[PDB]
Design a protein around this ligand. Sequence first.
Ligand SMILES: NC(=O)c1ccc[n+]([C@@H]2O[C@H](COP(=O)([O-])OP(=O)(O)OC[C@H]3O[C@@H](n4cnc5c(N)ncnc54)[C@H](O)[C@@H]3O)[C@@H](O)[C@H]2O)c1
Ligand SMILES: NC(=O)c1ccc[n+]([C@@H]2O[C@H](COP(=O)([O-])OP(=O)(O)OC[C@H]3O[C@@H](n4cnc5c(N)ncnc54)[C@H](O)[C@@H]3O)[C@@H](O)[C@H]2O)c1
Lengths: 312, 312
Amino acid sequence: AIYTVKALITDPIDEILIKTLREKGIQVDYMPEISKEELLNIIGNYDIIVVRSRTKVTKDVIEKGKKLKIIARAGIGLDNIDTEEAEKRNIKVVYAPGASTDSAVELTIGLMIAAARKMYTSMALAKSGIFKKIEGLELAGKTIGIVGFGRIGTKVGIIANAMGMKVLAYDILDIREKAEKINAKAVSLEELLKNSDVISLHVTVSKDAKPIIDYPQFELMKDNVIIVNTSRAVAVNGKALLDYIKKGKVYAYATDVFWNEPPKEEWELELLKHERVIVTTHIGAQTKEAQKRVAEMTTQNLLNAMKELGMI
Amino acid sequence: AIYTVKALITDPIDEILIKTLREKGIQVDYMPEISKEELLNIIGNYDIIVVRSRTKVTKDVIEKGKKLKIIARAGIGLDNIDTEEAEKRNIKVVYAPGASTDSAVELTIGLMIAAARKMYTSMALAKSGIFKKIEGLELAGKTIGIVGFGRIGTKVGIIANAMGMKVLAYDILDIREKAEKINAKAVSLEELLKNSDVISLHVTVSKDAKPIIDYPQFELMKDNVIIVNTSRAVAVNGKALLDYIKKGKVYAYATDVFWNEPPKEEWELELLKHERVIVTTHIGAQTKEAQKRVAEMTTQNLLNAMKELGMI
Ligand SMILES: NC(=O)c1ccc[n+]([C@@H]2O[C@H](COP(=O)([O-])OP(=O)(O)OC[C@H]3O[C@@H](n4cnc5c(N)ncnc54)[C@H](O)[C@@H]3O)[C@@H](O)[C@H]2O)c1
Ligand SMILES: NC(=O)c1ccc[n+]([C@@H]2O[C@H](COP(=O)([O-])OP(=O)(O)OC[C@H]3O[C@@H](n4cnc5c(N)ncnc54)[C@H](O)[C@@H]3O)[C@@H](O)[C@H]2O)c1
């Protein structure tokens, strides 16, 4: 008989993906609020599982999914998927890598300027009917250090250069020529830290790895440095950060990511309430355009994987 | 006998200017809080007057200043000086034109991104301990229309181009080649309005002139347009703006300038409180660097004027 391929969608997702699968005759079971327990009870009946972030595709879930051939994550990352277990089972894992680059780049520049100019303080004052001027720092002519020169880091550098800033970049990978191409200069982390007025973090690091910006790095920094982070909170030693903010060394820390969102620990709470700390609620990929690309890319990558498997 | 040249400083100003004059033997009377009335009583004894913004150098003040030879405005504009009367009296007027360009450019980019991404709303939520994501708009690939292609407008265009935006520009003056040089295209205001996703105002207009962005222009605009203004409030018809924001056509209005700061009129108040309106408290030139340049430039221009007069 003819195989009837079955897909399970466990979280609320863009209708484009569901519509695309249904149009092609694929049996799609949309259970956006399926419980942990019920998932384990039925995962064994599916060839494809589509998840966003609420659902965790752990090792035990994959083991139970004896028919799983494709795991689709409608997102820009795979932190909720056991990629190692998936590979062992030879299960294709697809998602939307790089789908939000420009949106993250733009928020980075926005945070840098908001931090440098105390825009939040000014906007709050304005809304209250108090039009009192507030003084900040100019960026042109200053040096920015891009830590993590990938998709996002490279573009932030191109923009900062256009803003008249001198761009320095550090990456564990070879970026000598890539940096030169955008009028930037690849240097050691030490040189970047000692010479940057603004430091922007755009690295990919694991959750259990030690922070890249720790005590020694903070000590190497210039006085009144502005630090921007739209990558990962763990890349920074939060306690060291609070220490250096209280010492008056760090002019401002602008971030779209927090160790805990919302904060729960005492030191995290102290950072959040500090006037030198600027925080957005992890909206780096939150634009209509980026979210549409996430859906389209996840859908297209899923279709390609299905075609390679001979399903369509 | 030898002329002893006398200078009157009527407002609190950067000590660099006062120190420079004193070092050169010039008689400097620093009266940062001198009243209107007292000013008129003694202005006739001075060759030079230095003002910032509190003091108004009106026609009657100049007439009384029978010995006035130089009027110095420690600022980026001359709205508090009767330049016409000054010219008739052949009185040299100096200040710091263009001194805050990069700071204004940076705030413009910051406002554009903050408006596009509802950064204020997100930051307010974060500070309250509510880390709820908010969706905005991406800028890359979209078209920005620079109205007023001068010092600031040109640089905003260079930066927007680096952000991957298509840049269009309109100016009453010839800018065909200037625009082309930065990968932008000079067009009519009509074409700019019909094709821009973002419109940034950087024009120099008088207080009694009709707004450049009035009803016909708002009608020509694209749906969901983002309008940024760091130039002058009067360049925009505020009532028409409120009308189009309420209609849902304008996605957001981000400005560093308001018709009245703080607002006093009912319609102004309605605009200020609207969620689609983003406002900073006229901090465009408020950076340590820009303010230092204002002082240095005003001081240097004052010295040059004095030298031409044979005073030093
Ligand atoms: N706030 C948001 O909503 C949002 C949106 C998209 C991406 N991000 C994050 O932004 C970061 C960058 O994403 P990207 O697409 O540019 O990734 P990328 O893979 O293109 O680039 C990451 C770079 O950082 C480098 N790197 C890793 N460890 C490093 C270290 N210790 N020192 C210096 N460089 C190091 C890599 O070698 C690489 O060149 C990631 O952490 C990503 O998850 C956040
Ligand atoms: N928010 C702030 O603190 C702050 C700081 C600095 C300057 N500004 C303001 O920003 C504006 C621009 O300053 P700038 O130094 O770039 O001035 P500029 O003189 O260099 O440029 C102004 C340009 O706008 C043009 N223009 C005038 N009327 C126009 C019209 N109707 N249509 C199209 N173009 C027109 C001019 O011809 C000129 O090219 C001014 O209004 C200035 O006062 C505000």
